[PDB]
Amino acid sequence: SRDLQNHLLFETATEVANRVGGIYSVLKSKAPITVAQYKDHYHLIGPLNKATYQNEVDILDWKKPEAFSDEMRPVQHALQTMESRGVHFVYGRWLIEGAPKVILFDLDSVRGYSNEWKGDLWSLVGIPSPENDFETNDAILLGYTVAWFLGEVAHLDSQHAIVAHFHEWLAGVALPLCRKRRIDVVTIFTTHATLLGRYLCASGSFDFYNCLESVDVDHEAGRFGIYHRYCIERAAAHSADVFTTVSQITAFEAEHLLKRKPDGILPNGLNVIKFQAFHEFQNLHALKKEKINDFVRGHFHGCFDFDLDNTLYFFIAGRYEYKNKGADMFIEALARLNYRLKVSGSKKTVVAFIVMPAKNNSFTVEALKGQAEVRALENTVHEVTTSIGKRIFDHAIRYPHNGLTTELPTDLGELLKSSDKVMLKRRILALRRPEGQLPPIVTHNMVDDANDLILNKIRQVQLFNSPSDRVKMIFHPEFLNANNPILGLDYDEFVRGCHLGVFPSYYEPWGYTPAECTVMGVPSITTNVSGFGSYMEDLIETNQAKDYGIYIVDRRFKAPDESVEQLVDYMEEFVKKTRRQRINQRNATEALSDLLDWKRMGLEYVKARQLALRRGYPDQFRELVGEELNDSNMDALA
Template sequence: MRTKSEKSRRSSTRRISKSNISKTLLCEVAWEVCNQVGGIYTVLRSKAPTMVRKWGDHYCLVGPYIESQASAAFDPLPLDPSDPFAKATLNLREKGFEAHYGEWLVSGRPRTVLINIDGVYDRLGDYKYHLWENHDIATPSDDGLLNKTLAFGYVTELFFRELARPTVTNKHVLGHFHEWMAATPILNLRRDNIPVSTIFTTHATLLGRYLAMNDPDFYDHLPFYDWHKEALNFNIESQVKIERFAANAADVLTTVSEITAQECVSLLGRQPEEVVPNGINIERFTAFHEFQNLHIEYKERIHQFVMAHFFQNYTFNLDKTLYFFTSGRYEFKNKGFDVTLEALAKLNYMLQREDSDMTVVMFFVTRQPFNSINPDVLQSRAMMEELRQTTKGILKQVGERMFYAAASGTDYELPNLNEFVDEYWKLRFRRTLQSWKNDRFPPIVTHNLEDDANDEILNTLRTSNLINKPEDRVKVVYHPDFINSTNPLFGIDYMQFVRGCHLGVFPSYYEPWGYTPLECMACGIPAVTSDLSGFGEYVIDNMNEPENKGLVVNNRKDADFQASADQLARKLYKFTQLDRRERIDMRNKTESASTFFDWKNLVHHYEKAHNLALSRLKERVK
């Protein structure tokens, strides 16, 4: 854990001044620039408007050219030789490399260089040889992803060499590299003393993620790991060496949380100079005062799914139903799926014991290999839609005939509505219901998994007997694919789904930062995080009474598994006891508190790192 003096030293670092920005070029480099893969894409995209406002045309992003993504998210610009980023791109082209210069079509429209690595592989042998000769990094030839990142790193290094030439610019050059997949240029830029100051940000150490998934006492063992032995054990020696050596070669090392800073010390061998917590672009989520209405709108869409999924078997009161969810990559322990499932079983018992009339539907939204959507799930949805069309037809016929009867009759009493329905509609109504209704338990998982028998979520639900029985007050829907607007089961995108839920549940064991609870807050949806996530730790250190703002931080640092599950179950139970007015008030407080995490309020951490890198560059080139 960081000492108070270390945190104080960080806080005393000054932000970069406007005067220094005017004399400096900043390039942020990542594999996920204009290439949506994971969380770093969200970091860069959401931060872009703030960075462009601060740096203007002195700021540029560098990423790989992936045609399928660039075609929709990248707009080319003319290669103006007076623009140093464009000039460096032009120089690369003249040397035979395919590089594109333009704007990333996200808020802020930041200048962006995209590098096509397809034509680089014939030069990769020499690059790999020099990595081994100069840096003791041996790289296998059969690792496709590693080869791609090395090819990207090779051309990115050449881009910085061109950018730093006096004939291209007389300004200072900062290169900010995110994660090991973009880190190899740091090694040679430092070795050859190229006048580029480098910042390396690890969002999660690669080895730390592997160890946390496989060691139940990861944090206790963290100071004692032999990094090289463990890297060999997981067959990731090349990647770990790239990450470790880049972290030590960079002028400035940063990471996203105090928790990950501990990993850097133990696994990378260096203490980060700055912690750069991840913010969010609140403008992207702003619905002014409409977020309550949006919650109602998208909750109704979730109602439609729930009716199709459950009501063919049994019913419950949707007005007394709460929608909880968790989401993220499938890491059963790291993402806290294990403790969430244990807490849900306890919650189910608590609600059953008091004979509660509340129902909780818990959604697990992650990605696992599957063959297809469960045909029974699709069939049930189709049959419910048929029932909807049937009832609309009956309603139309009854309305027309009832109006005529009332206008032309002399009886002031409400007539028998059955008399207005043809036998055709009566028969269709009956057959539709008979075809739809059955007495089976609703399925837990919406898709046919490739390895159903060994899925940890399913096996835990089976062991705890939480299998959507009628008497269960907690129902579970496991959706092993990410939700988007083309999804045939929901028909809404992920953030709309989030807005329709009542609570996000993310009690992670290993989470260097954690965007999902922050996205919930921005949508006005309360959330659970943990004190072992970077976000949760930041909340504890920087927010007063977070629970009153709709943010519960579950204790996992000083509690064992059962104690954490017990605490989470109590917090979930407490949430089920809120009435509708209290939940509305909580959503208002949550949405208001989310502005605390706007990039406008957090980007100063990056500014400190950039200022420190610039000062070290000036010392180096004296």
């Protein structure tokens, strides 16, 4: 007799009160709506980073009878049982919205039990475990600690059903342990990427999306020296009552590389912060865009022949992965976009930003001189207008006397004196670029300029920002930051000020980048091999999607050159839009923002926690409904 309406929840990951990778943000942003449903039933488990946990965890006492409710008592005794073995652990609240209960196991307080467990693991599943790989060692320690801990809680709680949720191989070890020790807990495993996937796409010569149904998993895994790691990922996948990925595209990849069709998808969601007024995001756009306008002025100083009221900001942003973030396609496509725009005699301009970190020696003197020279113009003009104001005012106040026949001045000469002009003329001369110098394609001195993939590509396709080029290239090899002396915008601000995000990804199990974009109501181009793009693809009919500002490029059933040409079409489709058209598109894009919010994506997590229970206890489940429902999908269950 165990409760399926009223059940516990344990979510486990390496990256708890501890930022290592993207999973941090996911568990964080997801916390509100989980606590909303679970409150003190919900608990998170992870390791213990001693060097940081202080800034993240509200340290609590788990000993006072006040800490746990009457039905959540077994946990108190279960944690006690673990202290009954000298296992050092911090209990408490995660300093984040929703403030959820965490169990953080200190790892050194089991390090001794290493070899005994390593050996136990080796003969149970067959998982080798080299000593020089500090990470699998930590994954093992953690796995044993956590399964042990769930062994006790299953003993002591007899009311609720227990759900254990694991994220990513690093925190997957416990999963075979739970299946073989036959413990009374339904388990879920989510994979956010596959080991073999990342590695097979690393060199980026391998034709991933076709040849994967044909690779020898053991062979490759051994080729990359990650057989041990791989075994863990595969174990976790196989042991789990429910197996999930973050997206369709990764699901496909999981099936053939981890040898199990995943039961369904858990797309990452966002904690969408709304505004009182719907149109407030339209305002912020124009505000932030003015700051980018400010930068472009200085960047193009003495070579500024276009109209910013007719300019579009394109960006790719993210990790510097030339081939997997599709920076190659971006640049190629832009080169072609320039051709199409010059040819049609269009007067529009595209300024394309590339925001990707690379080893640099900070900003070129250029980039800073220009920004300061425009400032020095701004300040001078402000002086002059003040003098002008005096003169207008005097006219306006003394008319019609002293022979003032007109209400206002009519000769500029009455308002602009020669010393005003001399000054202004001087600021203008400061902004003049040396003969034949075009504005740079990069705002930083680079550690290895000659070998940089991006710069080489920009120079190969010859986008050098000449006056005749209607597409412009600016590479900013550093993450954005309000403290930036030349582009004082944080990233999210910057995104808001842009017109189009362009993320033609090749390998991207989720892609937080276009999602963040969508939420800020910025249109974006994605690919069908991207987790986000693939998720969006199913939610909307293709022609409709463009009107919501989601463009999806086919990188799966098309030659790279066809894939590029599509990218140019979409970009060119977008440039032809009028302001009114873009405004509505953004309004539409902003309207999708809801569907990416946890209030909606959280259901998928629900459906998966359910499928776990209907699988663990189909008898109790059947009767607590009306009949037994289909259980080969999370889809067929609800």
